[PDB]
Design a protein around this ligand. Structure first.
Ligand SMILES: O=C(O)c1ncoc1-c1ccccc1F
Ligand SMILES: [Cl-]
Ligand SMILES: [Mn+2]
Ligand SMILES: [Zn+2]
Length: 455
């Protein structure tokens, strides 16, 4: 009636030993959590990272948000201090409910949220902070500067669960990517207020994400396991087709608020949780999620990729191609970068990269055979990684080229991937040129380095 809360997602309480390695722990819980899409992780009770900040010197620019179900919103991509915002946010919640803020039950805020977003009459708008860390506003976790740290801050400086360290460990595949893809591998900071929400979405390249609520009122999450992603997309194509009209930017993707009950009605499994201060939420690959904040709070989140993810990362790029969606980075460029550093790679990493590289190479062999039989004869090596990413997207499917592309003197600067050789210009095939990063004879040694390192 009105709102039936979805079943709770899994909640984990690792001992200090399990909690020690984040990647090991995630791999342990994965068979459970990937069935629900999201899961919650409660750190051991003494794991208590110091949060220190002055609420008066931290400034940020607020984003405005209208709260209407099925209305398109743009993915984030007139100035508050943390104190002035906190004052605005607490006054808002307190006035909305005529209650002291920490007396409004979470049950009620959830019910109320889904009421006001569905009611066309209500014109409720809220504000929020979302930005990567910077000089005006930095990580809520300890980092390193020319200012001195307390002995407890240094304890957490190198933690696995310090989300600054998360991308750059020897088990996050996104680590030794050197490309300038800052939105991806850097932590985002989120200042919430009551009802401020994050629309349904999956992470770029179907990465994991991990979210830490530093302090404040809870955050409410809904999640859908990765296997139900296309079920959910179908439900949303049916009820809100405007979100699916083609967009020209990776910054122009459209997303929306939608009642979990609507999804559950249409046989999509949804799970929920309330994330409280000091808890982590983890989202698995291609797991849809959305939610809202219960009140004033502060969260930090980062994307990451384990070896488990590599095959999905390839399937994701295939899927982007079939959608003509822009990529953040070249998956193949990443694989080859790792292969070229095979001597210093973690050995399970090296084993998994090798399996992905073997698929890459077989697929590339076939594609080159196909363009040869189409009459493309001339060819030259080309260092794709030197090109700005906007200078090496397939003109048809927008995939970021790295292994190979077709060019034509006829249309200077334009490229197509090998799936879209027909789509470049009208010249006969002999005017085309296969531009390639590597010959097959370069590639098999790179793969053998990986096999040696894995043994
Ligand atoms: O909150 C999330 O789960 C999320 N994941 C990627 O982007 C976001 C995101 C959401 C809302 C606002 C800005 C964002 F950046
Ligand atoms: Cl509304
Ligand atoms: Mn997300
Ligand atoms: Zn293409």
């Amino acid at each position: 009636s009105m709102f039936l809360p979805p079943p709770e997602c899994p909640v984990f309480e690792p001992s200090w030993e399990e909690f020690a390695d984040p990647f090991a722990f995630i791999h342990k819980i994965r068979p459970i959590a990937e069935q629900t899409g999201i899961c919650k992780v409660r750190p051991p009770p003494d794991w208590q990272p110091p949060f220190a900040c002055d609420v008066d010197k931290l400034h940020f620019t607020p984003r405005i948000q209208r709260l209407n179900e099925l209305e398109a919103q743009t993915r984030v991509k007139s100035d508050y201090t943390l104190r002035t915002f906190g004052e605005m946010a607490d006054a808002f919640k307190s006035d909305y409910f005529n209650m002291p803020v920490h007396m409004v039950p979470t049950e009620l805020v959830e019910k109320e949220f889904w009421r006001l977003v569905s009611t066309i009459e209500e014109d409720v708008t809220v504000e929020y902070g979302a930005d990567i860390a910077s000089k005006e506003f930095g990580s809520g976790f300890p980092v390193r500067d020319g200012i001195k740290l307390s002995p407890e801050e240094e304890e957490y400086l190198d933690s696995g669960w310090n989300l600054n360290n998360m991308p750059v460990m020897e088990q996050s595949v996104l680590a030794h990517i050197t490309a300038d893809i800052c939105g991806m591998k850097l932590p985002w900071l989120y200042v919430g207020m009551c009802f401020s929400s994050f629309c349904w979405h999956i992470e770029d390249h179907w990465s994991y994400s991990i979210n830490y609520l530093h302090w404040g009122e809870p955050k409410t999450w809904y999640g859908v396991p990765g296997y139900a992603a296309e079920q959910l997309e179908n439900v949303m194509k049916k009820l809100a087709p405007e979100l699916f009209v083609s967009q020209p930017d990776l910054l122009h993707q459209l997303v929306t608020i939608m009642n979990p009950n609507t999804l559950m009605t249409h046989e999509v499994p949804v799970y929920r949780t309330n994330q409280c201060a000091g808890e982590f939420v983890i989202t698995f690959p291609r797991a849809y999620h959305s939610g809202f904040n219960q009140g004033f709070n502060f969260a930090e989140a980062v994307n990451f990729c384990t070896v488990d993810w590599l095959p999905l990362g390839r399937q994701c790029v295939e899927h982007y191609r079939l959608l003509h969606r822009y990529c953040v980075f070249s998956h193949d460029e990443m694989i080859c970068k790792m292969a070229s550093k095979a001597d210093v790679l973690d050995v399970v990493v090296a084993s998994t990269v090798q399996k992905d590289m073997a698929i890459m190479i077989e697929d590339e062999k076939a594609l080159r055979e196909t363009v040869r039989k189409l009459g493309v004869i001339d060819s030259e090596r080309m260092d794709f990684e030197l090109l700005p990413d906007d200078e090496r997207q397939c003109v048809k499917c927008k995939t970021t080229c790295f292994m190979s592309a077709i060019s034509c003197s006829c249309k200077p600067g334009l490229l197509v991937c090998l799936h879209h050789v027909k789509e470049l210009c009208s010249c006969p095939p002999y005017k085309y040129k296969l531009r390639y990063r590597y010959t097959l004879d370069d590639l098999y040694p790179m793969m053998n380095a990986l096999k040696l390192r894995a043994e």
